[PDB]
Design an enzyme around this catalytic site. Sequence first.
Site, PDB file in Angstrom:
ATOM      1  N   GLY A  26       0.817  -1.210   0.000  1.00  0.00           N
ATOM      2  CA  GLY A  26       0.000   0.000   0.000  1.00  0.00           C
ATOM      3  C   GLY A  26       0.858   1.271   0.000  1.00  0.00           C
ATOM      4  O   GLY A  26       1.899   1.322  -0.658  1.00  0.00           O
TER       5      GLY A  26
ATOM      6  N   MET B 286       5.165  -2.569   0.412  1.00  0.00           N
ATOM      7  CA  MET B 286       5.510  -2.082   1.740  1.00  0.00           C
ATOM      8  C   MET B 286       5.408  -3.225   2.794  1.00  0.00           C
ATOM      9  O   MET B 286       6.104  -3.219   3.716  1.00  0.00           O
ATOM     10  CB  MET B 286       4.731  -0.845   2.190  1.00  0.00           C
ATOM     11  CG  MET B 286       5.082   0.384   1.424  1.00  0.00           C
ATOM     12  SD  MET B 286       6.858   0.763   1.368  1.00  0.00           S
ATOM     13  CE  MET B 286       7.193   0.947   3.088  1.00  0.00           C
TER      14      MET B 286
ATOM     15  N   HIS C 159       8.266  -5.950  -5.173  1.00  0.00           N
ATOM     16  CA  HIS C 159       7.882  -4.952  -6.163  1.00  0.00           C
ATOM     17  C   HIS C 159       6.976  -3.873  -5.572  1.00  0.00           C
ATOM     18  O   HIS C 159       6.044  -4.160  -4.814  1.00  0.00           O
ATOM     19  CB  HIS C 159       7.176  -5.637  -7.340  1.00  0.00           C
ATOM     20  CG  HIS C 159       6.714  -4.689  -8.408  1.00  0.00           C
ATOM     21  ND1 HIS C 159       5.388  -4.338  -8.564  1.00  0.00           N
ATOM     22  CD2 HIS C 159       7.395  -4.014  -9.363  1.00  0.00           C
ATOM     23  CE1 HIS C 159       5.272  -3.497  -9.577  1.00  0.00           C
ATOM     24  NE2 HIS C 159       6.477  -3.278 -10.077  1.00  0.00           N
TER      25      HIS C 159
END
Lengths: 188, 182, 187, 180, 183, 180, 187
Positions: free
Chosen positions: E61, E91, E115
């Site tokens: 996020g 994250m 990623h």
Amino acid sequence: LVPMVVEQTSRGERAYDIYSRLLKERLIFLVGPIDDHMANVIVAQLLFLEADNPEKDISIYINSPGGVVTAGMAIYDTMQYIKPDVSTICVGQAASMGALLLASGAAGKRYALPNSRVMIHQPLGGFQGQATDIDIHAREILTLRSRLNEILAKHTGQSLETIARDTERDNFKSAVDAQAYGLVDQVL
Amino acid sequence: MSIVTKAAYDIYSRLLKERLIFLVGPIDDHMANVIVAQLLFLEADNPEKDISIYINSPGGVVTAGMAIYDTMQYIKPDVSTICVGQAASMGALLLASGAAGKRYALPNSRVMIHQPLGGFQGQATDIDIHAREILTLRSRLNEILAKHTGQSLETIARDTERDNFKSAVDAQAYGLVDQVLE
Amino acid sequence: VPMVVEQTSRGERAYDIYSRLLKERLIFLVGPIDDHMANVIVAQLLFLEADNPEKDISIYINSPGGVVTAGMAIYDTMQYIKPDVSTICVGQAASMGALLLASGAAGKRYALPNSRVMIHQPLGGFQGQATDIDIHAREILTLRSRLNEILAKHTGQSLETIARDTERDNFKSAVDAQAYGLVDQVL
Amino acid sequence: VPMVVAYDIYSRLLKERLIFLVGPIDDHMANVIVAQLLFLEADNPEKDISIYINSPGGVVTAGMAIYDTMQYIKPDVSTICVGQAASMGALLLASGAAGKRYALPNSRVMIHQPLGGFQGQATDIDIHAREILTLRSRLNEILAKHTGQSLETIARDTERDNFKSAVDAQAYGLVDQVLE
Amino acid sequence: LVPMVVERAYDIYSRLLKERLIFLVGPIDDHMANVIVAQLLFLEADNPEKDISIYINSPGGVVTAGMAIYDTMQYIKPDVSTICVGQAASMGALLLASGAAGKRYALPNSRVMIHQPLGGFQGQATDIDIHAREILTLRSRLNEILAKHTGQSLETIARDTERDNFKSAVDAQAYGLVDQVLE
Amino acid sequence: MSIVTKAYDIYSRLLKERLIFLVGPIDDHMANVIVAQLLFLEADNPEKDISIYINSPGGVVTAGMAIYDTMQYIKPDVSTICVGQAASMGALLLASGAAGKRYALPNSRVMIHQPLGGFQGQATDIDIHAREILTLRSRLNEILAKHTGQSLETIARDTERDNFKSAVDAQAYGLVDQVL
Amino acid sequence: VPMVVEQTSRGERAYDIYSRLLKERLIFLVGPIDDHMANVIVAQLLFLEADNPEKDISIYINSPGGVVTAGMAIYDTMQYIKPDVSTICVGQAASMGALLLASGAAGKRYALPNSRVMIHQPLGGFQGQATDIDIHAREILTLRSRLNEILAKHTGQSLETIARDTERDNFKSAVDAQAYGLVDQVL
Ligand SMILES: [Cl-]
Ligand SMILES: [Cl-]
Ligand SMILES: [Cl-]
Ligand SMILES: [Cl-]
Ligand SMILES: [Cl-]
Ligand SMILES: [Cl-]
Ligand SMILES: [Cl-]
Ligand SMILES: [Cl-]
């Protein structure tokens, strides 16, 4: 958000929202448009206070633009039927059924604050059916209008002819003019 | 412990302690089962003392109203009824079905026995209530009203077709309540 | 939903009306049947069995029916637990609601005089409720037969009788439901 | 949700070491199940835990979070199918402690995994084809291991979106016992 | 519905918070990040010596929300153990990799994707436009953080973060994103 | 009261330790809740420091000014700590903590720029006119100059750019005293 | 939003932050003024009076104003109750909010240094909020003059000065609000 208070009782400390705390002082708030939901909550509070002490006065603070006629009549009938005197106090405004209830408090115990305003006029919307399958017919509207006029004439001291003429007008009376008309007894 | 006016907690629940039930708003399965639950609770707490139902309702779903009707008749306590505001359709049927001698109306309340078509139609998506069943239910409602009012079946069947409200005094004269509380 | 307040050793406590009657071993099965209400009824049955496996339980039924596998979850739990489960129709019982009414403990299935009972099962109860589930035709026919067998077993009617009558989407009165074997007594 | 005195009914049953896996599987309900499993383990790492499963399946990685937690904690996790168990619900059912997997007589079990459970649930995530094929194979391996069927059999049978009755689910090895 | 336990009454997460366990679940945004920060600060104050565990099941996020958690994890005195259940992406992956050295865990069927999609970098508020050079700065900063905690070189991270592919638990352990697969 | 993370919540437990969280967009509702916490903490103990953790994109200028005036008025020192970000009014309030007690964590970012949106009327019947916007922008610039030590001309030039400063650059600019 | 919990000998009691400050005789008048929030403020005033009719009450005001008769309900209640009602502007006070600020007990009306005050009354505050009420032109003019007279009385300005200045929809700074007589002191 309705604030809370904590009060000492004979049973110990208890939490109240602000309206239930004032209910312990025999004060009831009639605020906003009148409909069945809020009118039945007021009926419930009146019955509860009568059960708690049938001799002590009750006060209804009124700030309402009016609303559904039969819901307002349920409050009216309950006010008349219970043993305690019901004092009425207009703050902000009382219109339509709100004004009828204000004028129907116990004799000598109807009040308005200085900047409140009172309108007896009854818009058509208050008489129409509120449920999908109910159509309120013309004759019943006319019966209810005459009923409300008779109640007002009785509590104000005005003649029926005077109420029926003045209720056609869509305008507010000041607190002083409402006292003069007999809608309240005193401007506080 | 904590007390509110609107949800010995809220005002309604405090009055339930006093054997008082509020039947308010449209009748549907949700509120009818809450009323059945209150009736069964009050009978279990004391099967001897009267119960009062305050009725302010435009009516609604017929089978939901019949659930309340059957429960009222089945439990041991007398169930007194009081009309405040109005009682229409199933609400008027239930008002008329309180214990004999203990049905009341306030002076400005109004009563309408007429049963609109909307009360008979299926409330669930996969239910279609058919015409013969509607006629059977309309007749049963008429017979319930004839029994509790003292009117003939023929008088009920004729008068229920009109969708006009009766005053509280006219409703007493018709046998829908026993007394106007004045 | 009204509250009932009781005083105790450490102050007082508050139940809603349904929770208060659960203390008296009454369960309310009300409204359309789906997974959410079915699992809540299953939870209540399991709780009451664990609390006292000897005493009867009563389910009050006022329901138009609904999702078949959700109703089957209630059926199997009624059969599996040790207490007798008495059933009482108030208002109506249709489809899965009627099946569960008829599946109460023998001798302890009741209807009130103006209750109505419909065994017919509409297509809607059988279809997938989840986005990625398609309930296929043969599975519908299989479930329809399983439901007819449950009704034949609890009513005493022949499978042929149940299969004929379930195709009609008509109600039986309480008296006719009792004569059919869907309940034992009109109260 | 009714109350017992003061617990809600599910919390009261959690005290008895019963957890309810109900409705579609997603991260929110999976993480509540993981929390309950961890809590029950800390409360008593020896006593069995029961999971009641009534679910149409759902998100694969959410189900795998439940699967890994069931395998990791010390208590035996018994599973019971009520109503139905499809997709990840069926996988979790079949993954209960050996000998302690149950179904009720009218419950139904479908091992088939629709494409929907594998797709990204977050907006910015695209689940790619090779990852789908890897996960489908991992699920098939888990089912072969817990049912005793061959991998080939699971891979063939999982392609059909048909339900097994409780009796046929027991015969296949998805549960140990039908309860009556 | 979140179950309760009685010990007073706790919801299940508050009960486990008493056992110094925090759940980082679902998409990361300011709302959930600030709740995790509050739980970390509360636990540090209650006992600055004992370990804390964060269970992570998250698609990732908003980057600055995740950085609020990262900075708080590094700043407080207790070691913060991390455990991946289900998945950790973006994250979430970064936060998993940032647990105390030796105390980062994955369950066997967990998956990890470092990623970072563009969406995590854009402004979440109406009047904020996150400009291209600030995105490039943050991407480099995230890569440096991952390099530090995994032991991979900076350009290895930059190569592999471009691919939006998941690593298995075993491969995440081999890469240095966790220390151990718990079997 | 029962305990949750999200009755007695985690933020309330930390308020007991004199920590206030300023999180999310600034508007009247959240600003009045922060003023209430500041007044409550001052009345409970007028001598002990208070800490406000700031993670905010900024927002409505007069709401932020209500917080600013209350921070300056109450007796306790108000420490400020930036986690995540502080922009617009959030950056202004960060810069306005007690001298020496303004902090940033190593990866936080700070943007003093004030978008037009923060100055516009929020009520339907309020139009905020151009000269009042210019007056407020100047006042905010004066406040920043005072607390940072920068000249008014430096602030006025730099506030035009909608770019973030790193924690290290914010400290060098005088917006915080220390990177933690 | 936040709770404050206080321990006692019988366990624990809990307030939200606003209710906790109400215990200190502080009321928060925040957001747009309408009947709902106005009746809550009236109730708080009547409670604090009943609790102690001697002690001052403080209203913190951060409001863009709103419905005129709702604000008049608060005004009349402030003047009627026995306690002095202090007023403090934080953020802003406009329309009915500015009137109520100016109406605090003489000498006990305050503004914080960066707050702003706008006496101007938009048309929207005078219109009917109920569906069946049309507020007519002469009642609007009557209400507008009454507000101007209220402001003149409490500020010390002439009626002519208020009527001229209220037409402009501009804010006064705290120091300019103090010089106009709308507050007594900038804190
Ligand atoms: Cl006490
Ligand atoms: Cl018809
Ligand atoms: Cl098919
Ligand atoms: Cl596929
Ligand atoms: Cl692909
Ligand atoms: Cl395979
Ligand atoms: Cl990019
Ligand atoms: Cl006009």
